[PDB]
């Protein structure tokens, strides 16, 4: 499994022709220097690797989710 | 302090094998564990590997020597004998 | 080693993945100096091939 850091690279990767499905995982975390925040992991399943993008911003996650290709099957966990 | 009066390196053998054999061992075993001056780099870093093999830690030169000394007296004589006979042939 | 890229198995220099830097340096200097003396021994020989 490979982690993706660049959000722009992730959207270009999610529209690759071999991408079967996607996973949106929500983790209720806390930074211990504040209070609860909602982390989101976007996971793209390619032929060889699963690619994960960690989005700690609860608003950038929602914008990113609607920026994925509409054809991908998305599982919400 | 001085730990042993006379056995020295052969004190590892205890009381065994006979005193004459242990003092005969001591002479040649001090020589084989000594550090010798390197004729190549000038440092005193030459130690024995196996018999006849003497390596320098510094310059990594290996020279063929004696069983327990870097040079035997017989080899030193041959070195001068060969040197002398070489001069006459080459004038 | 068969399944890794070439940059992992070599160094960008002569004898890169085969010899160390100091041993390559000694080869270069030895090659230059010895070949320079080969010319000196040749011109000197030609000096003794015309007067003696």
């Amino acid at each position: 499994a490979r982690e993706i850091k660049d959000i722009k690279e992730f959207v270009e990767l999610a529209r690759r022709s071999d991408i079967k499905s996607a996973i949106v995982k929500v983790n209720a975390k806390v930074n211990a220097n504040g209070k609860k925040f909602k982390q989101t992991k976007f996971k793209v399943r390619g032929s060889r690797y699963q690619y994960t993008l960690v989005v700690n911003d609860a608003s950038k996650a929602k914008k990113l989710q609607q920026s994925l290709p509409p054809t991908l099957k998305i599982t919400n966990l | 302090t001085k730990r042993t009066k006379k056995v020295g390196i052969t004190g590892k053998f205890g009381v065994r094998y006979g005193s004459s054999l242990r003092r005969q061992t001591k002479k040649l075993e001090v020589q084989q564990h000594a550090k010798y001056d390197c004729s190549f780099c000038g440092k005193r870093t030459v130690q024995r590997g196996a018999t006849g093999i003497w390596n320098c830690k510094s310059c990594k030169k290996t020279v063929a020597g004696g069983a327990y000394t870097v040079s035997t007296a017989a080899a030193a004589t041959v070195r001068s004998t060969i040197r002398r006979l070489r001069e006459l042939a080459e004038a | 080693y068969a399944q890794v890229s070439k940059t992992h198995k070599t160094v960008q220099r002569a004898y890169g993945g085969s010899r160390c830097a100091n041993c390559v340096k000694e080869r270069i200097v030895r090659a230059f100096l010895i070949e320079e003396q080969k010319i000196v021994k040749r011109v000197l020989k030609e000096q003794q091939d015309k007067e003696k």
Binding site: - | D37, S39, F40, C41, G42, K43 | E26, V29, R30, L33, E36, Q37
Partner: protein, 96 residues
């Protein structure tokens, strides 16, 4: 005799001890004489005298090793080669 001349240069004149200092002094043209110990490796030796040929510097071949070359200079360490920058009260340059 040259040992006495060399000892005087160390006492009164200028010098560098060591291979790296000698090569720098040949590059800068500050060397008047290069002294090489007998047990110096030939590759290092044949390179020092190539530097001296380019630099037009005389070379003196010491008869002892780097242990004996060091002690002539009044040093408690080994000197494989040295360069004379300024022969002072001595006359080593006129004899070599």
């Amino acid at each position: 005799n040259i040992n006495s001349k060399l000892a005087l240069t160390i006492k009164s004149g200028k010098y560098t001890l060591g291979y790296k200092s000698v090569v720098k002094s040949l590059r800068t043209g500050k060397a008047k004489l290069v002294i090489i110990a007998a047990n110096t490796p030939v590759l290092r030796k044949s390179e020092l005298e190539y530097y001296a040929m380019l630099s037009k510097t005389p070379v003196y071949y010491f008869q002892g090793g780097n242990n004996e070359l060091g002690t002539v200079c009044g040093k408690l360490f080994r000197v494989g080669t040295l360069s004379i920058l300024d022969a002072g009260d001595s006359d080593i340059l006129s004899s070599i």
